[PDB]
């Protein structure tokens, strides 16, 4: 099709000027056209926000009915991603709108799962995913492919959080085969590394470094690796050149703390941890916060709170961390396994 052909040539013959050429081309397409519809998903799937936003504004005041719906549904997704709205506000706007497109009906169920994943709320994510059939789509084949990759990466993160890690890798490797879009490969590799964080140190670093190379240049994608490598190395007590000492973000400060413990500077770690407790953070965050306090004080109550927050978050992978500490402090292994399952 026009868009697919355009993109495939830009990629194969001008790979290094893809954004510059596609940005210009996509912004000169007529809002009402099938190509302008394919263009909006390209911009959002590649996380080209400034472009996606210009495309949404132009296609929201459009005459084609499919082009106007796309802009309206994505407008909510862009507001949820930018942090202007709540997952429930978004869920309300989706029920209010009457979606006539089978395509903007599958995207509607995915729009919330992205906020759910970002804020440690994994509980509501798996059910929505089962309301999606990509055979209900037949007019755009560019989207069905992009939505197909989008679902595999979401399904990998869902299986990762359920401790079904063989299924997580299978769905991330499927996505890596299904696409050439950078964000999907970057998030596929990141999910594979997090799936090996306890199983195999080497394979976690190999898949995290494979993603870091693809992300290189996108500072926002790079940061996901610098954070996870930083974590991987602090858990296996290894040299960690991936720590950001300049960031105030909770998840970053948590990595500075995990290093001070590995270096046995507990007084500075507990001071920095205590200042974090007052700060706004999700339930998943607090599972890690109390795991760190337990490593400094060896208080079983801290490991218990870690277990509690991981339980709320519904994180069946990272709950293993406090569970293992409790095993080594001679807590009953059978009870620890029931809390894991």
């Amino acid at each position: 099709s026009e868009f697919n052909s355009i993109v495939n040539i830009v990629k194969t013959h001008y790979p290094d000027q893809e954004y510059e050429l596609m940005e210009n081309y996509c912004l000169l397409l007529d809002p009402n056209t099938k190509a302008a519809r394919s263009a909006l998903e390209y911009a959002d799937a590649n996380s080209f926000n400034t472009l996606t936003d210009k495309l949404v504004e132009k296609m929201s005041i459009a005459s084609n009915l499919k082009s106007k719906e796309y802009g309206k549904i994505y407008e909510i997704h862009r507001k949820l991603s930018r942090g202007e709205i709540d997952v429930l506000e978004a869920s309300k706007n989706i029920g209010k709108y009457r979606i006539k497109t089978d395509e903007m009906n599958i995207f509607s169920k995915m729009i919330p799962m992205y906020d759910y994943l970002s804020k440690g709320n994994f509980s509501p994510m798996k059910s929505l995913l089962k309301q999606i059939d990509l055979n209900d789509i037949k007019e755009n084949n560019y989207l069905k492919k992009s939505f197909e990759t989008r679902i595999y990466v979401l399904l990998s993160n869902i299986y990762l959080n359920e401790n079904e890690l063989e299924l997580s890798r299978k769905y991330a490797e499927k996505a890596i085969k299904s696409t050439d879009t950078k964000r999907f490969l970057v998030f596929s590799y990141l999910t594979i590394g997090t799936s090996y964080i306890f199983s195999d140190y080497a394979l976690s670093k190999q898949n995290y470094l494979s993603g870091y190379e693809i992300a290189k240049g996108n500072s926002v994608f790079e940061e996901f690796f610098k954070r996870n490598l930083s974590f991987l190395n602090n858990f296996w007590n290894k040299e960690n050149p991936w720590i950001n000492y300049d960031s105030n973000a909770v998840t970053d400060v948590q990595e500075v703390i995990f290093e001070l413990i590995n270096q046995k500077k507990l007084e500075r770690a507990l001071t920095l941890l205590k200042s974090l407790e007052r700060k706004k953070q999700n339930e998943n965050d607090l599972g890690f916060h109390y795991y760190l306090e337990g490593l400094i004080t060896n208080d079983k109550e801290a490991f218990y709170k870690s277990v509690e927050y991981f339980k709320l978050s519904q994180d069946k992978l990272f709950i293993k961390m406090p569970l293992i500490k409790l095993e080594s402090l001679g807590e009953n292994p059978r009870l620890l396994k029931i809390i894991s399952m």
Binding site: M113, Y114, L117, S118, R150, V153, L154, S156, N157, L160, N161, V186, F187, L190, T191, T194, I197, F224, R227, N228, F231, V250, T251, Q254, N284, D285, G287, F288, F318
Partner: peptide, 6 residues
């Protein structure tokens, strides 16, 4: 802590 994305 760890980070996730899709």
């Amino acid at each position: 802590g760890i980070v996730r994305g899709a």
